[PDB]
Amino acid sequence: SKGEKLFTGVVPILVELDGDVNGHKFSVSGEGEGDATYGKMSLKFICTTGKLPVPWPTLKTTLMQCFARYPDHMKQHDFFKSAMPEGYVQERTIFFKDDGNYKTRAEVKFEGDTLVNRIELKGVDFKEDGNILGHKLEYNAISGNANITADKQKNGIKAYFTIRHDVEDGSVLLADHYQQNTPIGDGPVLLPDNHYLSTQSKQSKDPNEKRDHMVLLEFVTAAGIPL
């Protein structure tokens, strides 16, 4: 793919999210750099509207699979870069077990040399005293697999996976993700064999930052097809 060539170096990242969860409006900005050669993203996110009304961990998966490292033997399965620079639409529904759901729609595309991820999120049916609106989730790192499958009908991909969010009481809040991606442009894309993306994450705070924020260092690798 021609899009693959746009990711061989370090790429500036810009993220914008407008959210509404049970009527609580908020916005998030992010910035960083991606180095897909190494599957790496270095990111910092800020809540631009004050305090986030949901836990940072619940937004991590919403807040750029184009930065995954595909091993050479799997490069024909990288839909995400093949859709660049025109980009793709990424939609999810995230079902939180015994709580509400998030519906997200994002456009991921280049604006010049910057990879931009613009997101709208709507959350409904959340429990005002639950683990999400009650802020009862551990601020720790999310790591694991996103299962990718071709969606030939939509000239794109679907993904599915469950995030296990640690709760402050030792329990787990399951977040069941259903994902659809469709190219924005009408140029040809790569439709993959089944595989997954493996994410390793380190989450931190900026000790000099007074705004509500999250710092992430992410490594994402495609896998599941043998050498």
Residue numbers in the entry: 2 to 64, 68 to 231
Paper text:
Recently, a fluorescent protein based on an anionic tryptophan (Trp) was developed and was named WasCFP. This improved variant, which exhibits strong green fluorescence under physiological conditions, has been named NowGFP. Spectrally, NowGFP exhibits green fluorescence (λex/λem = 493/502 nm) at physiological and higher pH levels, contrasting with cyan fluorescence (λex/λem = 429/475 nm) under acidic conditions (pH < 6).
In the monoclinic (C2) crystal form, the crystal contacts are categorized into three types, denoted as contacts I, II and III. Contact I is between molecules 1 and 4 (or 2 and 3), which has the largest contact area for Mono. Phe99, Tyr182, Gln157 and Lys156 from two molecules contact each other without any water molecule in between. Moreover, protein crystals are highly hydrated, with those with lower solvent content typically having better diffraction quality. However, solvent-content estimation reveals that the orthorhombic crystal has less solvent (∼50%) yet results in a lower resolution (1.7 Å) compared with the monoclinic crystal, which contains more solvent (∼58%) but diffracts to a higher resolution (1.45 Å). In the case of the Orth(A) and Mono structures, the key residue Lys61 has ∼80% k1 conformation and ∼20% k2 conformation under a high-pH condition (pH 9.0). This shifts to ∼50% k1 conformation and ∼50% k2 conformation as the pH decreases to 6.0, and finally to ∼20% k1 conformation and ∼80% k2 conformation under an acidic pH condition (pH 4.8). Even though the high-resolution structure of NowGFP shows a partial trans conformation of the chromophore at pH 4.8, this is difficult to observe in our moderate-resolution structure (1.45 Å).
